Amino acid sequence: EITPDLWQEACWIVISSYFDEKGLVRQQLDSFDEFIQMSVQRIVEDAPP
Amino acid sequence: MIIPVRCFTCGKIVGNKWEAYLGLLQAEYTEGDALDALGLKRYCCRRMLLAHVDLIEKLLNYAPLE
Amino acid sequence: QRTKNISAISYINQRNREWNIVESEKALVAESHNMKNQQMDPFTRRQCK
Amino acid sequence: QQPMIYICGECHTENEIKSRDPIRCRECGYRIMYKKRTKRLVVFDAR
Ligand SMILES: [Zn+2]
Ligand SMILES: [Zn+2]
């Protein structure tokens, strides 16, 4: 059921869930992990014999 | 990092009221009522208990030995 | 080591945040209830077209 | 006769370290250790 006029509070629960699941610096960690996960393997594989 | 000893503006001793304030908040009271239950009339001395952050706990987590 | 103080502080924090959540919810329901009239000078909102 | 006692990093155990010696804890073996407070007349004014 829709949430009329009781929405200031419900608006910040979603924000809290987001900031709990993903940190403030999550982009840095994700980028570095993706690097260490795929980029290195890609670079070492695509290099010619 | 620790509750001050005196109210900066007023000077009334507030250091000896942190444990009491926590107990009063814990049992049932609310802040606005606990504060005047302790006897903090002037709004200058209330900021001591409302705004104060308790970091000494985090500091004690780093036990030197054992 | 944390039986006293270190645990009581956490207990008071959790109960206080729960009390704040319920306080916010009761404030929201009360704000919804008292919908008789809203005539205030210092507030405004855009209305295009 | 002061052998320059040190405090191990994690053991928090005293050690006797002299010059021209490796810096390690008597047990476990770590590479970090701090010094002990002086014995001087540390006097502050509660001002
Ligand atoms: Zn004051
Ligand atoms: Zn060692």
From Swiss-Prot, chain C:
Compartment(s) where it occurs, according to its Swiss-Prot or TrEMBL record: Nucleus, Nucleoplasm
Transmembrane segments: none
Role according to the record: Component of the PAF1 complex (PAF1C) which has multiple functions during transcription by RNA polymerase II and is implicated in regulation of development and maintenance of embryonic stem cell pluripotency. PAF1C associates with RNA polymerase II through interaction with POLR2A CTD non-phosphorylated and 'Ser-2'- and 'Ser-5'-phosphorylated forms and is involved in transcriptional elongation, acting both independently and synergistically with TCEA1 and in cooperation with the DSIF complex and HTATSF1. PAF1C is required for transcription of Hox and Wnt target genes.
Subunit-level organization: Component of the PAF1 complex, which consists of CDC73, PAF1, LEO1, CTR9, RTF1 and SKIC8; the association of RTF1 appears to be less stable than that of other subunits. At least in HeLa cells a N-terminal shorter form of RTF1 is also found in the complex. The PAF1 complex interacts with PHF5A.
Domain remarks in the Swiss-Prot or TrEMBL record: The Plus3 domain mediates single-stranded DNA-binding.
Protein name, UniProt field: RNA polymerase-associated protein RTF1 homolog
Lineage of the organism: Eukaryota, Metazoa, Chordata, Craniata, Vertebrata
Gene name per UniProt: RTF1
